Design a protein around this nucleic acid. Structure first.
Ligand SMILES: [Mg+2]
Ligand SMILES: [Mg+2]
Ligand SMILES: [Mg+2]
Ligand SMILES: [Mg+2]
Length: 1229
RNA sequence: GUGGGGCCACUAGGGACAGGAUGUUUCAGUUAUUCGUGAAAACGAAUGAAGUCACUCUUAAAGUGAGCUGAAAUCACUAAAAAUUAAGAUUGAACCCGGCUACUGACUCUGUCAUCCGGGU
DNA sequence: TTGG
DNA sequence: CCAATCCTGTCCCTAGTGGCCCCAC
């Protein structure tokens, strides 16, 4: 029984062709074809960039919160009194906007005095040659600081123009000026301009600049006058604040990491221990030591820690760069002959065979360096045994025996007198060499257990051959063991043996050829540095140019410009090789191994640039491979095998992950359908022909195979299947060179459309061709059918009838928030908070209005207002009465209104409460600030019109109070519109913004955004040195809300803060169903994760649901025809989900959609408005409606299509038919 | 010409740690006074910062909106810390606690600390 | 880009 | 019709391009 599954593989679209042979060789119609969508990152997130950005945003917020908490704790501990809100506000103002921790180098502007300013007139036209460049640059920078508009525009022009320096370099070269000096000066002035822009317009500032700013601002702030009094001076308070603000998030995460600290208790010992924990976490730079020492001696030796924070300079405690070099070391992939598994398999006898083999004279010198190699742990199991302090499987003797065994089995053809891999192969011959090797064997090991040793040898060679193919995981019973322990990163002891190769040195204890100066101070290192510099400059063309130059020189041809340089490099490398041979005493052949520029360059890189990460394998593996290579002479034994590399390209890994299961599942569903009743074997075959533009294929195969075993272990163990696997990878172009073309010609149905991008079914066709191919290899896919190999026409005409009029599509999706138990792994609420207002009530007497002012546009008249006031009752708040002679204003109490809106949402409420909740939500409206730069179209590079900016959709509020709430019916204009008008009617803008769309022509203003900035860039006095910069100015509008949720949180003072967000995902989990089986389509059944005491869904009310129908529950509804079959599910609260299975001719007749048969169809079809209208008018069924935006998601293709879509809008007929189907199922139970 | 394996250079791709700035909303204050002198040209300064504009009333006393300034919040369950905006079938990652018996790293020259190892969430 |  | 936006230091990793030198099929 065969279970071949051919996979085309791809970035997104994955073609699969799978079958189960069952009845015999090849298969009947049982064959199946699938295509895998693997959607984009927005439909199924794989990249963690957004996730880690959110995590670091939360990390920064929590860092600030914990720093403020600790600062308040310490300040209250010193004061012996609680901080007033003003003191808290001042302290937090000090703690806000600390600079970045990067290292800043002072700019050397003096070099600007060494150049002529005229050559800079291309970037600085206003400059002249009559004055020094430094003076003009200082004046320009000072004007920029003083907000001089001319200086601002000059800086902007210089920054924009000096992006490319080629013209400036040509100009300076025209006067024979040094290009390097002028380039350095230009770089210096560019750096100065960029720093000025970053500090002034972004307002970043360094940490030291932040410390200086708070030092200047602490005396001026009077709210800190008591605090400074308790801290015995401004300097000590500044030191304390700067020291606290220098703490990282992890330092503040410690200390507070205690359940007893929810009451914010202050203890000096914990603070000192935490501060010692920090500044020991950092790896300070070597040049930055003696500053680490100062901080550590201050903190560790602190007898008061609070007085130490007050006395230590905050500039010393600025953290260094975070070097997470040991965050996750790679795992060594070396495969080691494991004495643990050797014990588990053969008892003691394997060491007995090793001992017997060692005694033979032919095994002399095979344990040459094992006394010095065994001291280094090589595998995870040996590491665990040594950690436990009890070596049982991995003693020194056992490790020696395993190493000797592995060396003997892996000996090269020259050194193998026993001729393994031939004396053991099942296809062995009967020559005299085999007989004499057998006689040489079993003379030491013994004929009593020769069979066991040969079985061991066969299994070992088979599994190392599988490892060499990158599929060592398939063996299901490993006798080798992966290292899975971290290697070191290239330290000096590692360095000595890394230079052992290349130079071919056996026991290099010290690099004497580099230190003892055989040829003076210029010994090797300078010449090798020059070689490396030249090779890096020439790049990847270095080898080609060097070879051409050497060939020309050997032929005696004329030398080119670079030929002399290459010959000089050849002489230099010859000299370096001579010096190395003199210092090491190596033979001619041993010397030639590194007589090329690449070897010397890599030696220099090793010695001088060693800090470049971890090495691949452990030192034991490196030493064993060095012994096996034996570069001093000929090689003995082959190098150690290794597994495929576990680390991958992150999200790409995830891709394959999902793909694997999304194929394995299908295979499971294919295998579960057939019993096969045979307890012997099933041969699952993998064929992969990924069209790369094994690496990723090996990991994909690993995941697919492991997940298939995990899926089918139950079905296998129930009735003894015990699946077997084999991997086959085909050539990149062979399947697409002739097989695909021949099949396209034979069938004439798909014809290999290409069309610059393969359609959805083309990948399935390619996977089918992969299955059909590989039969000619006779080694890969050897037994894929009978090896008859009939003529080309007959051979290829018996395979062209596949794809039995169906091509299934699998579209992975990100599960659902309803089916997810850890709902925190999903974005619940969208970013951005919306403002929640309530319309004021204006009362003159018997005349009442709802709105902002008594104008006919600013308010709506209310009749019978006593009903409104009676229903509102305690939810209204008087405006402190004030001058009642004018009028009375009643404003909705925000706290009571929000509490009541949560009460009516989270639990059943009385009729009065629901009534006043309805009134509150009728008075409710939502606004949000949008930037004034929205008046400018950043895509068309022109300003919008007044009708496109002041549209009534963004400023009108509908008042629709019913008869029992007065009769307040009308529309109000948001007063913020009058603030938008003032912006549009501004003098700087009244001409740029046109009046209407027709008036607005093709005129463009590329610098409109900077113009708007300069309009709104206000110039405050420098009263505070720690002020925040502003670069966004906005005005309110009425936004397009979507699933509003009001969240209750706590401020620093413990009050209730209500903030309105938009839900990012599904809100309704289903539709409630009564005892009679009737679905209530008009009720919102909010998912249970939103029913929290701190969450209030907008317009949501309590709804009891003992029985309901889920949004996923599909049913085949009572369609009016037998030609098509349609299924419905609720899907979403407002839009049903419709799945239609129908003849493809019916789909092409209903819709004006034309394509090159179903083979050319896409997975997602975008219907035009004409196609949507055709589909609606030709389906003759409002039961199915129309797709949302003409989007159709195809499930299966062929003569009978099967697709699904989300409707544009729900219908009564949709609900009626789904209710009929659900009632049928409910009554039938 | 074949792949496998150890070491170097090049771009990119991925994950993590530190974060920076600005937004959005909530709350509060501003709707403004005083000195340089008293002609006050007119701007500078002090009050921690902000002190402005528009609309609706009636005999200035305001209501409403915006702006400005300041802090606070900025997924929920969920709170001291952690996890929490990826997947979920399975996982990865993150963080905390313990240890130097030991794989790796920073110090150090012989003992600490970890991003390491073992647990837990 | 899909649930309001 | 709606979904906040940019930039910065470090470290380690995977995958192409060429080149070094061992072992082969
Ligand atoms: Mg604000
Ligand atoms: Mg804050
Ligand atoms: Mg170490
Ligand atoms: Mg620890």
């Amino acid at each position: 029984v065969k279970s071949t599954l051919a996979v085309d593989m791809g970035g997104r679209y994955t073609g699969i062709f799978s079958y189960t042979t069952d009845s015999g060789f090849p298969k009947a119609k049982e064959a199946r074809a699938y295509v895998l969508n693997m959607p984009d990152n927005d439909a199924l997130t794989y990249s963690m960039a957004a996730r880690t950005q959110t995590r670091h945003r939360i990390r920064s917020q929590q860092r600030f919160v914990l720093a403020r908490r600790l600062t308040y704790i310490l300040i209250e501990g010193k004061l012996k009194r609680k901080l007033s809100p003003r003191e808290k506000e001042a302290i937090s103002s000090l703690l806000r906007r600390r600079g970045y921790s990067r290292l800043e180098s002072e700019l050397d502007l003096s070099v600007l005095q060494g150049v002529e300013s005229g050559f800079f007139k291309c970037f600085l036209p206003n400059f002249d040659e009559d004055e020094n460049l430094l003076t003009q640059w200082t004046s320009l920078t000072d004007g920029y600081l003083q907000n001089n508009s001319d200086s601002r525009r000059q800086i902007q022009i210089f920054l924009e123009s000096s992006k490319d320096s080629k013209e400036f370099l040509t100009v300076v070269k025209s006067q024979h000026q040094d290009t390097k000096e002028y380039k350095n000066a230009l770089k210096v002035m560019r750096d100065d301009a960029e720093s000025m822009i970053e500090q002034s317009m972004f307002g970043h500032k360094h940490r030291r600049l932040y410390l200086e700013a708070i030092a200047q601002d602490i005396p001026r702030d009077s709210r800190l006058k008591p605090i400074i009094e308790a801290f015995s001076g401004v300097e000590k308070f500044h030191h304390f604040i700067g020291n606290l603000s220098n703490l990282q998030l992890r330092a503040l995460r410690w200390y507070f990491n205690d359940p007893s600290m929810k009451n914010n208790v202050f203890d000096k010992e914990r603070l000192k221990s935490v501060l010692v924990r920090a500044y020991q976490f950092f790896h300070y730079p070597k040049d930055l030591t003696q500053q680490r020492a100062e901080v550590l001696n201050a903190y560790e030796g602190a007898t008061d820690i609070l007085e130490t924070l007050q006395t230590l300079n905050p500039e010393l405690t600025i953290p260094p760069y975070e070097d997470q070099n040991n965050r996750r070391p790679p795992l060594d992939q070396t495969l080691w002959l494991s004495p643990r598994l050797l014990d588990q398999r053969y008892g003691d006898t394997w060491e007995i065979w090793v001992q017997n083999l060692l005694r033979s004279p032919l095994s002399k010198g095979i344990d040459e360096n094992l006394d010095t190699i065994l001291i280094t742990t090589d595998r995870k199991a040996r590491l665990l045994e040594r950690q436990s302090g009890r070596l049982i499987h991995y003693t020194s003797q056992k490790l020696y025996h395993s190493y000797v065994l592995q060396r003997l089995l892996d000996r090269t053809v020259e050194n193998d007198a026993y001729l393994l891999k031939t004396l053991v192969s099942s296809n062995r011959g009967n020559s005299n060499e085999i007989h004499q090797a057998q006689e040489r064997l079993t003379r030491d090991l013994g004929s009593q257990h020769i069979k066991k040793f040969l079985d061991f040898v066969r299994q070992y060679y088979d599994e190392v051959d599988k490892a060499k193919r990158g599929l060592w995981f398939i063996v299901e019973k490993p006798l080798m063991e992966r290292a899975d322990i971290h290697p070191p990163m290239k330290n000096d002891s590692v360095i000595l043996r890394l230079v052992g190769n290349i130079l071919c040195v056996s026991d290099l204890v010290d690099l004497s050829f580099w230190t003892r100066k055989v040829k003076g101070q210029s010994t090797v290192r300078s010449l090798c540095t020059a070689i490396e510099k030249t090779r890096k400059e020439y790049g990847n063309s270095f080898n080609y140019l060097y070879q051409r130059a050497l060939y020309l020189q050997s032929k005696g041809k004329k030398l080119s410009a670079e030929d002399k340089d290459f010959i000089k490099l050849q002489s230099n490398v010859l000299l370096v090789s001579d010096v190395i041979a003199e210092a090491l005493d190596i033979k001619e052949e041993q010397k030639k191994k590194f007589a090329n520029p690449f070897s010397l360059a890599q030696l220099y890189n090793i010695i001088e640039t060693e800090k470049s990460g971890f090495i691949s394998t452990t030192l034991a593996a490196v030493d064993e491979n060095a012994w096996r290579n034996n570069l001093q002479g000929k090689a003995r034994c082959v190098q150690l095998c290794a597994d495929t590399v576990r680390p991958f390209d992150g999200a790409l890994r995830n891709i394959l992950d999902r793909q694997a299961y999304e194929i394995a599942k299908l295979k499971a569903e294919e295998l579960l359908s057939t019993e096969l009743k045979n307890q012997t074997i099933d041969l699952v075959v993998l064929l992969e022909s990924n069209q790369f533009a094994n690496g990723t294929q090996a990991w994909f195969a690993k995941s697919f195979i492991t997940k298939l075993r995990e899926l089918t272990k139950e079905w296998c163990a129930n009735n003894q299947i015990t699946l077997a696997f084999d991997l086959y990878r085909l050539d990149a172009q062979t399947v697409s060179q002739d097989y695909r073309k021949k099949f396209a010609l034979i069938n004439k149905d798909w014809a290999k459309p290409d069309d610059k991008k393969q359609p959805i079914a083309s990948h399935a066709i390619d996977a089918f061709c992969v299955f059909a191919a590989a039969k000619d290899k006779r080694n890969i896919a050897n037994v894929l059918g009978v090896f008859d190999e009939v003529a080309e026409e007959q051979n290829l005409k018996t395979i062209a009838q596949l794809m039995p009029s169906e091509v299934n599509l699998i579209s992975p999706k990100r599960k659902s928030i309803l089916d997810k138990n850890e709902v925190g792994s999903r974005a619940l609420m969208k970013e951005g908070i919306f403002a929640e207002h309530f319309l004021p009530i204006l009362v003159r007497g018997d005349d009442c209005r709802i709105g902002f002012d008594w104008s006919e546009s600013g308010s709506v008249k209310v009749k019978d207002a006593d009903k409104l006031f009676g229903v509102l009752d305690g939810l209204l708040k008087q405006s402190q009465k004030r001058s009642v002679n004018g009028f009375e204003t009643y404003t909705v109490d925000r706290i009571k209104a929000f509490e009541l809106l949560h009460d009516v949402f989270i639990r059943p409420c009385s009729q009065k409460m629901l009534e006043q909740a309805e009134v509150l939500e009728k008075l409710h409206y939502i606004t949000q600030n949008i930037s004034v730069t929205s008046v400018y179209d950043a895509v068309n590079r022109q300003f919008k019109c007044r009708e496109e900016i002041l549209k009534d959709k963004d400023f009108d509020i509908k008042v629709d109070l019913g008869n029992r709430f007065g009769s307040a019916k009308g529309k109000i204009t948001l007063p913020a519109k009058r603030e938008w008008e003032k912006l549009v009617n501004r003098s700087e803008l009244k001409n740029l913004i046109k009046d209407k769309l027709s008036d607005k022509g093709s005129e463009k203003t590329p610098d409109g955004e900077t113009l708007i900035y300069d309009i709104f860039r206000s110039i405050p006095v420098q009263k505070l040195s720690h002020k925040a910069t502003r670069r966004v100015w906005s005005l309110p509008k009425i936004p397009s809300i979507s699933s509003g949720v009001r969240i209750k949180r706590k401020d620093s003072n413990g009050n209730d803060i209500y903030q309105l967000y938009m839900l990012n995902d599904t809100k309704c989990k289903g539709f409630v169903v009564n005892e009679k089986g009737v679905i209530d389509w008009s009720s919102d059944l909010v998912a249970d994760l939103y029913k929290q005491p701190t969450l209030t869904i907008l317009n949501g009310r309590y709804l009891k649901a003992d029985q309901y129908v889920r949004m996923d529950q599909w049913y085949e509804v009572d369609c009016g025809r037998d030609d098509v079959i349609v299924k419905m599910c609720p899907g979403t609260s407002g839009r049903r989900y419709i799945e239609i299975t129908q003849s493809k001719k019916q789909f092409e007749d209903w819709t004006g959609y034309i394509s090159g048969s179903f083979w050319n169809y896409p997975v997602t079809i975008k219907l035009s408005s004409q196609q949507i209208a055709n589909f609606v008018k030709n389906s003759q069924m409002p039961l199915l409606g129309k797709p949302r935006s003409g989007q159709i998601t195809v499930i299966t293709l062929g003569n009978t299509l099967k697709y699904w879509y989300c409707v544009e809008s729900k219908n009564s007929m949709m609900n009626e038919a789904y209710q009929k189907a659900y009632l049928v199922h409910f009554n039938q139970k």
